[PDB]
Symmetry: C3
Subunit: 114 residues, 3 copies
């Protein structure tokens, strides 16, 4: 899995350990081995949500499987929870796009997962 | 809906009010309330288009519905128009990827839009 | 086609001519004219792969066609090769998401490619 968060929260407000916390909790939520989890946090962004520049986040979670209605609801609770607690972003100012990737469409280690 | 623009145009060349103008015009184009529109502008990027580094943009528009052949042509005219007028980017140096998102595949406020 | 690389490798470690090399190599690999190839490199990113902040990359290749099982394996060998040689990133610390875009879902020059 790959999780990306783009946010207007400044870099200094991203707590130490945040990438590890994301890695751990995503491994647990998706069932995937931690070795396969990639995380990416992009602070200091020029963004607006609902016309407002209050703290917000635009995110994506890509995974080969483990994507669906119930699972995505669970991931959203988890991830909005972390963004609220750690970055002080209101859950109603977060969008997360979920992508169920075909194994043939994910490159890794000179090949694909197909 | 969520609109992201990545560009090599410098930050100082992004005019005051641009995020609001994007929010307003996207609300109108998609027919969705501005409260549901997110916008994200990423200047100063290391990019090339067609082998050269004159102003260019790589963009995405994600929406739950309101995506299709005719609608996307209309969005492209609108968005290229704005990028040309405000950021001085030639329309022939802009790509916009359109994504019709399933409601169950968009997280928001601890759950999804399903 | 459009190729984006997000990496924690610092800007100074990205070789002069990297964007041009990517453009030429992708033109050859996809068979598309270089005029249609866009490339985007984002260094200095806060990211982890497998919980580790050793050099890594999260990438995407979007193309209207020229995406499939065998082609994506070939692209992965090519692009991992380039990231290893030029950015010193291990191929097992690279993800590349492939997207076969519908022509109607790619905006360019005030319209779409449909």
């Amino acid at each position: 899995p790959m999780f990306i968060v783009n946010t207007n929260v400044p870099r200094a407000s991203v707590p130490d350990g945040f990438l590890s916390e994301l890695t751990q909790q995503l491994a647990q939520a998706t069932g995937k081995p931690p070795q396969y989890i990639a995380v990416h946090v992009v602070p200091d962004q020029l963004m607006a949500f609902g016309g407002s520049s209050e703290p917000c986040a635009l995110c994506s979670l890509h995974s080969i499987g483990k994507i669906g209605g119930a699972q995505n609801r669970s991931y959203s609770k988890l991830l909005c929870g972390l963004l609220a607690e750690r970055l002080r972003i209101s859950p109603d100012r977060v969008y997360i796009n979920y992508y169920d990737m075909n194994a043939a469409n994910v490159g890794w280690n000179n090949s694909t997962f197909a």
